[PDB]
């Protein structure tokens, strides 16, 4: 429900970080979104669920 490359807010731990969507994938009856956290290396890039995403 989010285009790739789209800038969003992604929740990691307690707060939301400004992020960018790198991949969108569907599997096992569910969406999962690979995001980059602006300010942080590829190291910190990770998959996350819809729950954790927020439209800018």
Author numbering: 51 to 106
Q: What's written in the study?
A:
MRG1 and MRG2 belong to the MRG protein family, with highly conserved members in fungi, plants, and animals. Firstly, via their chromodomain, MRG1/2 proteins act as readers that recognize methylated H3K4 and H3K36. In addition, MRG1/2 proteins bind to chromatin that contains tri-methylated H3K4 and H3K36 via their chromodomains, the bound MRG1/2 in turn stabilize the binding of CO and ultimately controls the activation of FT transcription.
To identify H3K36 methylation readers, we performed an in vitro peptide pull-down experiment using Arabidopsis nuclear extracts, and identified among proteins detected with mass spectrometry the Arabidopsis Morf Related Gene (MRG) group protein MRG2 as a binding protein of the histone H3 N-terminal tail methylated at lysine 36. MRG2 complexes with the H3K4me3 and H3K36me3 peptides were obtained, but the complexes with the H3K27me3 and H3K9me3 peptides could not form crystals under the same conditions, consistent with the ITC results. The tri-methylated lysine projects into the aromatic cage formed by the His62, Tyr67, Tyr87, Trp90, and Trp94 residues of the MRG2 chromodomain. Consistent with the structure, the Tyr87Ala (Y87A) mutation in MRG2 disrupted its association with H3K4me3 and H3K36me3 peptides, supporting the idea that the hydrophobic pocket formed by the aromatic residues is essential for the binding, as with other chromodomain proteins.
